[PDB]
Amino acid sequence: GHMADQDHAQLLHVLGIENLRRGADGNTDSPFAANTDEAKANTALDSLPPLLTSVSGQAIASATDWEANRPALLNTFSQEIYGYVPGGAPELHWKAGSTTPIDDSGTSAIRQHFTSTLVHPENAALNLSLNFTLVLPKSNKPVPVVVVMSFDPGIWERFRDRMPAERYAQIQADNARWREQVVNAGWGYAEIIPTEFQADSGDGLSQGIIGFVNNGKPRNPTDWGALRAWAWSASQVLTYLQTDSRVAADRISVHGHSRFGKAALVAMAFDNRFAAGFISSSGEGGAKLWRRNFGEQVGNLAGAGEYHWMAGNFVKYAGPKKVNDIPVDAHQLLALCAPRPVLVSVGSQGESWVDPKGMLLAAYHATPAYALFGEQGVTQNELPAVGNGLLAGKLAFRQHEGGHTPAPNWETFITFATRQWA
């Protein structure tokens, strides 16, 4: 849309940036196609920022030192990468309807819809109606709940009449399956559609929650973008869930896939109340190291089509700065989740855009922070055989046998979280 283009252009003007390097293309016949040749993907890894040097420039030698550095390290991710949550972000007050059984079987599993209304003090066109759906298995005790970020299912339906049908059937089956796997494990889930909180476009940056807080004005370059706002939305659901006696307050997980996998990891790192993370095929801007040249590139995320995911400040790393200059990398983002358990998940079929091994490497290079806490992580720097999970530490990696989908790793994640919480 033209508004994304206009805001992007004004952002470059505000940072004093003439040109950005192009992003990569995904089709291999293009001159700009992404590198997928492992031999050409590691030039920048020598500038990898030292995980265990604090922002003050001291050596980090203990769990205590890592926690003392955490706010400063988060602050760098806020100003330069994902943006600050403004203090003006409001409290969400939720109203719930009645519970209804999830199916007519006589299960005691229930569904309940929650709504929060925000009236803007100045401009009613910024008003918001925000939602999540809670699903709980029946239990005599508080149950774990995974906060789930989903793609708007109105999208599968808009295109039901135009899809191969084998594939529509398979998406619908996967969508039903994880819901059943969660409940059968004695977990509930709390589902949000993130794009109802903040649109997935620069067009919407003056709308949604970012626009509400900004009174419909353009972002300053240190303000949150969409990933951080989606993570904030998940965090507000966790805040509700910790007031609900049906929920185990120390076993609220977060999950998202693809662009929501990026957001879920941002949530995991920034909100240490989340008890476990299922981070699926997140890629560039998520668990993939920026300094890998493999699949999606910084120029993709600094460009008009995806910059809205990021702080405005981030686009400088595609222009007057290079990937080598990013003050942090994805191993520090995973490290920020320590000591809490995180599964980095990716498929094996058609996943080059997210760089399976660059995510592995992020976990590998994050692990010395988990080690400070007496915990284990990822200890090899090459991909295991597909399907062989590195599942023993609090920081874990499993590449499954499928494509760009989380469905083959829900079983692994639920089992993993249960074992790591014991």
Residue numbers in the entry: -2 to 0, 27 to 445
Manuscript text:
Three TtCE15A molecules were found in the asymmetric unit, with a Cα root mean square deviation below 0.2 Å (all atoms <1 Å), indicating a high degree of similarity between the protein chains. Like the previously determined bacterial structures, TtCE15A has three inserted regions relative to the fungal CE15 structures (Reg1, residues 122–134; Reg2, 175–200; Reg3, 399–415). Although being shorter in sequence (26 versus 40–45 residues), Reg2 of TtCE15A forms a much longer helix compared with the Regs2 of OtCE15A, SuCE15C, and MZ0003. The longer Reg2 helix present in TtCE15A builds up a larger ridge around the previously proposed lignin-binding region and thus presents a deeper substrate-binding groove compared with previously solved structures. On the ridge built up by Reg2, multiple hydrophobic residues are found on the side facing the active site (Phe-174, Ile-178, Trp-179, Phe-182, Met-186, and Ile-194), whereas the opposite face is more hydrophilic. At the N terminus, TtCE15A has an additional extension (RegN, residues 27–55) consisting of ∼30 residues neighboring the previously proposed xylan-binding region. RegN forms a further deepening of the active site pocket opposite Reg2, a feature not present in any previously determined CE15 structure. The serine and histidine residues of the catalytic triad found in all previously solved structures (fungal and bacterial) are conserved in TtCE15A (Ser-281 and His-427). However, the proposed canonical glutamate of the catalytic triad is absent (similar to MZ0003), and this position is occupied by a serine residue (Ser-304). In TtCE15A, a glutamate, Glu-374, is found in an equivalent position, which would likely fulfill the same role.
The aim of the present study was to investigate structure-function relationships of TtCE15A, a novel CE15 enzyme from the Gram-negative bacterium Teredinibacter turnerae. T. turnerae has been isolated from the gills of a wood-boring shipworm, a mollusk that digests lignocellulose in marine environments. TtCE15A has an α/β-hydrolase fold similar to previously determined CE15 structures, consisting of a three-layer sandwich with a solvent-exposed cleft comprising the active site with its catalytic triad.
